[PDB]
Design a protein around this nucleic acid. Sequence first.
RNA 1: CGGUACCUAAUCAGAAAGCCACGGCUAACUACGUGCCAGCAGCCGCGGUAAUACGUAGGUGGCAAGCGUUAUCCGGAAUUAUUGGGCGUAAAGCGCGCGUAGGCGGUUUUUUAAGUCUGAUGUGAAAGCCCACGGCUCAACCGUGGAGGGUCAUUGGAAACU
RNA 2: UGCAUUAGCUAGUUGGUAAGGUAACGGCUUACCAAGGCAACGAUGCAUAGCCGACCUGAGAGGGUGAUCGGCCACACUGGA
Lengths: 156, 135, 131, 80, 89, 198
Amino acid sequence: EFEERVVTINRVAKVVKGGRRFRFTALVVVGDKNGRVGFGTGKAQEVPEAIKKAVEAAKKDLVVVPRVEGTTPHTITGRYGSGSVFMKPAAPGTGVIAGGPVRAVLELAGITDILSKSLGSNTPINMVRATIDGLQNLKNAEDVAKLRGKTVEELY
Amino acid sequence: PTINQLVRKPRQSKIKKSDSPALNKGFNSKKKKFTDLNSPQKRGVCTRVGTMTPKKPNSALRKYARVRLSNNIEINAYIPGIGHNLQEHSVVLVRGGRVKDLPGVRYHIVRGALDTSGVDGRRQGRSLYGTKKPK
Amino acid sequence: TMTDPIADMLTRVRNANMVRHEKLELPASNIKKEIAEILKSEGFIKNVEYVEDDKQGVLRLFLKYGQNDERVITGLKRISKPGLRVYAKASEMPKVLNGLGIALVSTSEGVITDKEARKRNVGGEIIAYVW
Amino acid sequence: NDRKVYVGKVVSDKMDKTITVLVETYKTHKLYGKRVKYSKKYKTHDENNSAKLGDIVKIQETRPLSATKRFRLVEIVEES
Amino acid sequence: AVKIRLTRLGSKRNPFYRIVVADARSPRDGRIIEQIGTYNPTSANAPEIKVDEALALKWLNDGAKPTDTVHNILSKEGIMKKFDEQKKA
Amino acid sequence: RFRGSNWKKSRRLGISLSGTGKELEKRPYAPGQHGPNQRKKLSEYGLQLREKQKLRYLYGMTERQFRNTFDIAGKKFGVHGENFMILLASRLDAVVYSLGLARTRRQARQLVNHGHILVDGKRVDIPSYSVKPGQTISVREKSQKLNIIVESVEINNFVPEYLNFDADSLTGTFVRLPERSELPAEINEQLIVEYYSR
RNA sequence: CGGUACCUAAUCAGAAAGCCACGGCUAACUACGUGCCAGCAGCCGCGGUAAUACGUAGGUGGCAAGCGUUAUCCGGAAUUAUUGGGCGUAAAGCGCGCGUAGGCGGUUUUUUAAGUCUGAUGUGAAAGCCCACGGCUCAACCGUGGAGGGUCAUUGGAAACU
RNA sequence: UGCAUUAGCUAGUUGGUAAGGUAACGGCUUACCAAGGCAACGAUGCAUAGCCGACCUGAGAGGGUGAUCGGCCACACUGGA
């Protein structure tokens, strides 16, 4: 189930010699609670198509987040442009404490044991990019030991 | 920087110039000096009482007063409320609290405390403006 | 007039790791060859090879990757420098990427690694958080 | 018992039996952890003008024989 | 001189003395020489006498004196009764 | 504490467990003046505030009684959202309502403060005293019967999990502490823990 | 202190909460004046005769003997950025130098154990500070038991790197 | 603690030489000898402030309060004996 989360409504006014438009764009985050997470937007007007074309746009790319279960396996961060996020793994019995673009990809993957020091910008585009571009750069233990050519259980 | 020259010159922090400079100052009356003890409200006495025009395009005449504090600093203090007992020479109490869209005047006048009573005809802002709770 | 040998040597690896190289080398010392041994002791590369030349001969790297045209060496950074020589305690020594990297340890016990100093009960001069 | 028996190396022997050795070591900024060299000369009494120029003099503290003379001589190694 | 006393604790109208053998020149809650034991006589039944009598053998033999209320719980609990043979040396 | 009449309280909050139910008489959307309108929600930050409001108003205490137990829920290193409830379930507030000593809790939480309930022996005047499980939660023998004391014992049996009872002057035992499955889903206990995170 | 606290009985359902908004931030709205006036005003701002924003009044709301204002230190805030900041056009290179001090320096071997990092203890402070009980009607508020320093000293050492 | 919009600081000073005298030490003072000693690592001077434990909030890196509550220092109209 491609779990939806909206960010905002919008209005854009292109002042010309004539008249300005009433485009109502948006941007959403679409995860699945499995470690296969996307996000999407669209220059739309319809609040359904603000979801629908963007849910279609998020289903242009669901990124593969490797999840050693129970939390996010490492103490990680994010990076895009002028913004950057941060995640520290923690206990399960906490209650998730994060924000708007830093909680979004973190809650639609079912992990719930993390931190959030959302550094960088306040523009949610490159923020939720950094929430995604950091998270896509995650790696597990078993594939890297395959990639390095050691064994999996040799790493502790 | 370098951590070498950070020993040679440390990260000295930044100061913060605090608002309301007339409320964190006393007066050594014996030696004509000044103390700094940060009162909530320092009392004073009115010298002039008038009003002022907001230069921002909101339009009113908001009433202010030229008050001299205990430490004899002359201010321009906003007199909130509608009616008052502030003709002249009222020995009043003065808070901080800036009124925006009004240059220079950044102090309130504590209603109903020192020598004024508060305003009368209020029924939604009763705890302020000197009105005791009815019945 | 370079000051950190083990960092410019380490960033030259990442200098060609970006453009997907499979073969580079580095100069030698008493340390830096044996430092390059601890990489291929874990075996992150195919094999680091022999020192040949007159003074600090080139010892190869042979960068070993994944089958999806990938790279294994994510993150390459010496932490110490001339001006800041940093050390580690064995009792609160961390894990690089929470158990997905390595962190080597340098003292007069022989230049050891994260596994080779957690059960050695010595710390030392830590260098690389390479994951 | 004993007294403190620190070391040094001379800088200026003053007129009539006052040598001045130099001690220096490495203190840190605890905010930074980076240590830095720093010096603290502790002036010793030379009993018989024993120490010379270049001498890495090990001395030993006493109670004040004079205003500055807190330390007395035990060990002298070389000279330039 | 140096002497055993009654240095108290506890909330309002409720004392918790831990005994202290120290000088008379200090205040009653001042800096001490030795906090030996506690004594809470104010209970419903007990005096709650906890005593490590090993150090009364030292101090009462070279300068410390029991003084007029700390003397006679030692004659009650038997702290100085063991000292009665230890002073009989 | 609260000190109300719960007939409108079943309609006001999420739920507050008045009796069998009180919403079916009038329109149960809202009590009045603005309800059947553009029905607006509030935030998840306000939903956990509302989920706090479905349990602060349910248990009837104030803050720093529902809030100062939350830091001792940080002393017990289990699930913070439910180990908070098991210490909240371990007091004398479960007695004056659940085991029937009145038609509500208010007439019976009066009855402990007179010294007419007298749990664990002589007298415990206060309900903030946690019922440390094992003490004989008793009844004063000089107040054995009323119009309220033995009446709702017959109405409401099943004194809840890890609190037994009797008709031997209506005395209990409170043999252990009940878990989160002995905590009702009338208000979701997991969604209080993040309003106290904020 | 004090016959104060406490226990018995009698007693009436007895004699007791206040305050700011109801604009968007933020859950709590509507009518009378009102006509940029009175006035509110944390930022954006309301009032020009149809104000939800002012002022007048019922609901509620946040939570209880407080509520609100005022001023004062900290987090929020990595706007002092060791951790964790920039110097082309945004604030950050003098007009360039040369140069005194200072800082920091290529490469490869061997000595010390000084610096590093460990191991035997003593071992770091009383309300403050780890963990678990005891005392408080709960509790407010006071003790217990090691933990104990895992930082400093008395002590043994190890040389890649300084 | 900070100021170089405080840089040159000291001359019984700076070392020693003899008397004191102190529970002891010596430039501590007195007769002698050289200008030495102190310094940009900011001596000197200015301005400000009892110190510490302790408080307090900070992820840690910690640093701000002292009514508190303890330990030490200084004071008792002022200034000397």
